[PDB]
Amino acid sequence: QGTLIRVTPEQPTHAVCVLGTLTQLDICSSAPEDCTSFSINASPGVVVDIAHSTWPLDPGVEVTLTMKAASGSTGDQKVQISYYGPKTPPVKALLYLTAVEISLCADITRTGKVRTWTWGPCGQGAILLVNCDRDNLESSAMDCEDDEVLDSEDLQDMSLMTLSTKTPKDFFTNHTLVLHVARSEMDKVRVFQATKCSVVLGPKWPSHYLMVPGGKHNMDFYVEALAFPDTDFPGLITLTISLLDTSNLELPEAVVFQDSVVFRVAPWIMTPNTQPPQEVYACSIFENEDFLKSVTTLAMKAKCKLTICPEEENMDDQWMQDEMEIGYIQAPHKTLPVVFDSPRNRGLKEFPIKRVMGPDFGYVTRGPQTGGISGLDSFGNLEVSPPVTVRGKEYPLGRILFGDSCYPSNDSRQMHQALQDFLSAQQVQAPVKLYSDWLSVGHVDEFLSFVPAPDRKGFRLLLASPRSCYKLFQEQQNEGHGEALLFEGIKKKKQQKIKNILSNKTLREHNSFVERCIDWNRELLKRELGLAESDIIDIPQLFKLKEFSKAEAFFPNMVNMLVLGKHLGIPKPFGPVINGRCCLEEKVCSLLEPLGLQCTFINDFFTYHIRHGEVHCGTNVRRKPFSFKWWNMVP
Amino acid sequence: QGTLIRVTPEQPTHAVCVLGTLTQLDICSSAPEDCTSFSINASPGVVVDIAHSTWPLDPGVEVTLTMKAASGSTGDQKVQISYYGPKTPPVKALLYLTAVEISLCADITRTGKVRTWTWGPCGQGAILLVNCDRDNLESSAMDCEDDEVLDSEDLQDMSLMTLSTKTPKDFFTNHTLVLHVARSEMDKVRVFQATKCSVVLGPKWPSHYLMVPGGKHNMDFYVEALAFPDTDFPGLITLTISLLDTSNLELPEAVVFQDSVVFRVAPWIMTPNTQPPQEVYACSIFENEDFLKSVTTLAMKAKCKLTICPEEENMDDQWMQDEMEIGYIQAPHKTLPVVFDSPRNRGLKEFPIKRVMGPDFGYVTRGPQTGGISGLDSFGNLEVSPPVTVRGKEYPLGRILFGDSCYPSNDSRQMHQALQDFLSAQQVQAPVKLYSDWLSVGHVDEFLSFVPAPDRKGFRLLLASPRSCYKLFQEQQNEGHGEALLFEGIKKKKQQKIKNILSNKTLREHNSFVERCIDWNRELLKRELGLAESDIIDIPQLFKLKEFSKAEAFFPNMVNMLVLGKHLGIPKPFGPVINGRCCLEEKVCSLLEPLGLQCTFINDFFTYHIRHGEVHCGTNVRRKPFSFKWWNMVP
Numbered sequence A, B: 001q002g003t004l005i006r007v008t009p010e011q012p013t014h015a016v017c018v019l020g021t022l023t024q025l026d027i028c029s030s031a032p033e034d035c036t037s038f039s040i041n042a043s044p045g046v047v048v049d050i051a052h053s054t055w056p057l058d059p060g061v062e063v064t065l066t067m068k069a070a071s072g073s074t075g076d077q078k079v080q081i082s083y084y085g086p087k088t089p090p091v092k093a094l095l096y097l098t099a100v101e102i103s104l105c106a107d108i109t110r111t112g113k114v115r116t117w118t119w120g121p122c123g124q125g126a127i128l129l130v131n132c133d134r135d136n137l138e139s140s141a142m143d144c145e146d147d148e149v150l151d152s153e154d155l156q157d158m159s160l161m162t163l164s165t166k167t168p169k170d171f172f173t174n175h176t177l178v179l180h181v182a183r184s185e186m187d188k189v190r191v192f193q194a195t196k197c198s199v200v201l202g203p204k205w206p207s208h209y210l211m212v213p214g215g216k217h218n219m220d221f222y223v224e225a226l227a228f229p230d231t232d233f234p235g236l237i238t239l240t241i242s243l244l245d246t247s248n249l250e251l252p253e254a255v256v257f258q259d260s261v262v263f264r265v266a267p268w269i270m271t272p273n274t275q276p277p278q279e280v281y282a283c284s285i286f287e288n289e290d291f292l293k294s295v296t297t298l299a300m301k302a303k304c305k306l307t308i309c310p311e312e313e314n315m316d317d318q319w320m321q322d323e324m325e326i327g328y329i330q331a332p333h334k335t336l337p338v339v340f341d342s343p344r345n346r347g348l349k350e351f352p353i354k355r356v357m358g359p360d361f362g363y364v365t366r367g368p369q370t371g372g373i374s375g376l377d378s379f380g381n382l383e384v385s386p387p388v389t390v391r392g393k394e395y396p397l398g399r400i401l402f403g404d405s406c407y408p409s410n411d412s413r414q415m416h417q418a419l420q421d422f423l424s425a426q427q428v429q430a431p432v433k434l435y436s437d438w439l440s441v442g443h444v445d446e447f448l449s450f451v452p453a454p455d456r457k458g459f460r461l462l463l464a465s466p467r468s469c470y471k472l473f474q475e476q477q478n479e480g481h482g483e484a485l486l487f488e489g490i491k492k493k494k495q496q497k498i499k500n501i502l503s504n505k506t507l508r509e510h511n512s513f514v515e516r517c518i519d520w521n522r523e524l525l526k527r528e529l530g531l532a533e534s535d536i537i538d539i540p541q542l543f544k545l546k547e548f549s550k551a552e553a554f555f556p557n558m559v560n561m562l563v564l565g566k567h568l569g570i571p572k573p574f575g576p577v578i579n580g581r582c583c584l585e586e587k588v589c590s591l592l593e594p595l596g597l598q599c600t601f602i603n604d605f606f607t608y609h610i611r612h613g614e615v616h617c618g619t620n621v622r623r624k625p626f627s628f629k630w631w632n633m634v635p
Ligand SMILES: [Ca+2]
Pocket: A143, A144, A145, A146, A147, A148, A149, A150
């Protein structure tokens, strides 16, 4: 701020001046009469400035004091104001000042070293992590649920704030420092004093009297956040230091100086398929051994850790895609992966809590944990694009994509509002709603996927395409193969010839309708991600409508693939074999191999496909966080 | 949006094109082989554009159709694409198009006539009022609490949205229009169809099938909001129209076109003392008759309606300042005053509900209505500045000011968070927290007030000032009047001489502490309102500390005044009479009369002052809304 000090010939005034502060003088209000003019003299540590030699006694004339160093003792710098007139001997008013340093410091330039918070690479303000992992090897709670620092590792997650004082040795005889946080925000932050660590602010306490010695002192605090940005929390936390005059034992304490630091809490951020893979997840269940070896091979080729959830934990839930999504949070001092656990709560319910969350692995959940849910809350319906720039505006972390109905009806489904709100409140991947409710299961992974590409924007959008499959199949009939059988290679499955598929008119009608649902999203994506046709590749894929006229995959849904860098784990369509090969596999390879991609076709037919999901639905991936720092975006 | 239409020689395609939409053609995906090139011919109502005569068959070549007018009948515009090659006779693919107009329209230029919402005088987007008055002369509920329009006057409060269609006469045989709102927002808006009015959207229904005839039609809707901007509602409401293809009786309906309008809900806005007065409020209680005549005179001189709450309604609550604050809401079509009713809930509890709310007078309340409250929730602690510009940034409606503690402790008080959040969420008067908890009662009206001024910025900030009173009194002792008595003119009150007041050292100590509390706010206001010293006038005023060392007025608190334009109703200090006059009254007049202000001193001593409030605390004012339109600010 800056104080105004009123001087009088009546008696000398005494005041504290905090370094970095504007200190001003009122000289006219008690200037004795007789008097026209004034002079100022001050000791060498005080700098005096006068805008608007000696001056007239005009109240508009501005006098300011700044002090070059902290005082060694109380009142060791002096100012003397001299009032005089035509025939009037000078009269002196004295001001004894004590200068002190009070710097509340934090990593506001976002470099790991120690007003307002602003975004961008020219912005300012410190970052704070939600301490939502479990460095504590003992219990089952996120580190930030108690009021203690139980491991020293835990401190690496926290943000350092330092209070730095320089005062006379007896200064805190008559002054006291208090650290505080608004009641509004105290349930979202916890601050520890490092003396060993003890809580000074938190849900329970919004202010704390500090024990500070006179002289030079540095006091380190460690800060953790306890809540992510959300509908009712924009994500900023302000911590303030107040200096109080406690000189007078009869009067209340009086505020002399306040300063603040403002932290932003780090958002939860997702990683698209174009980010290098690091660890792969799946379930082992009855009779799925061979699916797992293909997944194991592919992981091995992509240099990835593998992690499997045995049927004793699964409780027969094979849909490892659906219960969780692995993102990260990121600060200059620390980055760590964090699982967003879906309120789905089927047999994999425990897996995120028990097996994923842990040392340097965070946890978050949203939405009601018993009931009130739908299929659209499963995380095969939560995806994210690669980085894109859309008509000037940069999304350097991509944009989250999730499925919805085209309008709300009695029969429509949506992702739960609490999830939607959470995702929007993370800001930095500005979500886009797509249309997926036309699918029986209802998930955006059922019709799109993204893959790396060495040119253009770095990727291609893959979309399922009936059109592409009708064209492929018609082509084959044209060159003589109308007799060729879909489902060749499968036992207890009624083969169908290309010619009967092309001539089946209901099937063609169903796929026309699907074609419209997908086209609609195509244009939506083109608009909201700034894609051109040359960004998109259509994957040949047939559907059929079933209960409530909702769409299912006619043969294994190849777009529902596992993307591990250049290694793809694509569901095996079992298409008509022509010239030694499945023409579907051949058509796909012809579209993906020129991008450097390797397609491995995995058999998931009686294991996954007949339970209405594929390879992507049965797996999950943790991937490398972006290198671009989220705080440098201007959302 | 814009659709992409896939053409084939296989058979002709049929499609709808909504006017104002980008329609594009895919010509290559089913271009038969043999073929190198293509030509397009179309009927006269279709405009064809080709970037990147006749053209090669390059998939990157872009073909777009726009249509100049609505179709008179289905498929009445045609496009014919001709594929040909070196030795290949042309083959034609046909496209039959039907053009329609679907305009969902609203007052987006904010002029009373009928994407996104943007602020400022070059921004765009319609405005919507919370229908929080009671035009219904019967009951006691805000108009917007039921699902009906009961008076035709009620419609003046609502926003008009018009759907405007032009189609073939049979168009809605195979298509249907649905109007909707997100489930997220359905509890905040209610939409009526004007056929008489009936509800089509609201808390109960998020989508409605519209009954629309073919041909030209215009359908009027009337919209009301039901919630103000708040912590969990940024204030935007989007209403969407979707066009569905219902051609196929076997398949689900298919979305063809969506469009939206976005409304912003009007914030609750306060009016500073510098806005011309219109109506004045007070209580009649036992033995306060003479206070009321002075208030009556002053109202009369300011051309103001007067309104009094008799003791049968008061229930002995005389503090008309404290239970309510009169603001307004404003849209291009309608502006009306709205009372913000404090959760104080003492004897005036009913007054806002029963007597203020009514035809063209709105109502709002926040915070818990039983308990959990403090003195700081009373609306003498809610004020607003005149318009100001602060280091470039304009606050054309001023900034709300309300009192707080300097930091939260076990003994500190604050205005309830729900009030604070509500006020911030109104955006346009960006609240400032001041320090008022040092006062026994705790209200910013106890130390500041604002008054019109014919120069400078249009106003002066008045602040209570012990310094000013010590200087006045010392001056008088200097010119011979140390014997003069404070409380001259009062019976059952112990007079005190100027000389004993100047020499009372505890009193001087108490006022030094008060002086610091006020100085602290002085600088705060100077910073947050961009004030200079020449904006501020100090009013001579003494205090004393009492229970819990909290401050009370030593003599009647003159800053706690009724400002009715140039007519001021200032508490009568009963200061020492010197040369025929109260020297306090004289000092005040000397400071205010040069600004054109007229000071009337009202006796409130045994009626108000001894119950720890003054004239401002015993009254309230409705004032003229600003002329500057809130939506033109860029907050
Ligand atoms: Ca802990």
